[PDB]
Design a protein around this ligand. Structure first.
Ligand SMILES: [Cl-]
Length: 209
């Protein structure tokens, strides 16, 4: 089975979390930061709204690997919504690492540079929180920009975007399978639709570690 969730950002000015929860959504990932200085200005309102509605929630960071080291961006994310504790409410932070919206393929980095950047981000995140962050990407992007790199599969939960009625057939890297599948960019209650791989009990274990 799966558990329904979703992800949102300042592109959604207002979200009815109560309505999403009534409709089966149990968790939400919320954009907190991007690059080295951008704070998503709706994050606070979303995160509070999600908390009051009883959803599991966590933050996500939009990576811009050309702008700084992975550790710098991890630290910025951690100070601005990307934190985690075992409080029954919190998903580990998610690194959104994929297509550069600013028009340079793979952010101008080589495979080895990109793999190093992502290692730097995820290691900093783990150092600070004791949790490996989730990695959000597509199989296509992971192949192009990392050379389909192994080494993250046994530590970082994979959040895999592949818009389809059927679950993803191509699993990147050395991941066994996805932890969360982003199945559409058109969710009724706002943002993107997500599906956690398993029952609620396993989702609560993703939250607690
Ligand atoms: Cl790219």
């Amino acid at each position: 089975t799966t558990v329904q969730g979703f992800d949102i950002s300042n592109h959604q000015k207002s979200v009815n979390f109560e309505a999403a929860k009534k409709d089966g959504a149990q968790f939400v990932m919320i954009k907190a930061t991007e690059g080295t200085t951008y704070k998503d200005t709706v994050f606070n309102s979303h995160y509070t709204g999600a908390t009051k509605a009883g959803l599991l929630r966590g933050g996500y960071h939009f990576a811009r690997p050309d702008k700084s080291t992975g550790s710098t961006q991890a630290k910025f994310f951690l100070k601005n919504g990307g934190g985690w504790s075992d409080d029954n409410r919190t998903l580990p932070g998610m690194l959104d690492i994929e297509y550069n919206p600013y028009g340079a393929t793979c952010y101008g980095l080589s495979h080895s540079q990109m793999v190093a950047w992502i290692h730097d981000f995820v290691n900093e995140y783990h150092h600070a929180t004791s949790r490996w962050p989730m990695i959000y990407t597509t199989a296509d992007w992971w192949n192009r920009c990392t050379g389909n790199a192994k080494g993250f599969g046994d530590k970082c939960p994979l959040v895999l975007a592949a818009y389809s009625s059927s679950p993803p057939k191509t699993i990147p890297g050395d991941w066994k399978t996805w932890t969360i599948w982003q199945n559409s960019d058109k969710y009724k209650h706002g943002g993107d639709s997500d599906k956690f791989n398993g029952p609620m009990t396993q989702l609560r274990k993703l939250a607690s570690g």
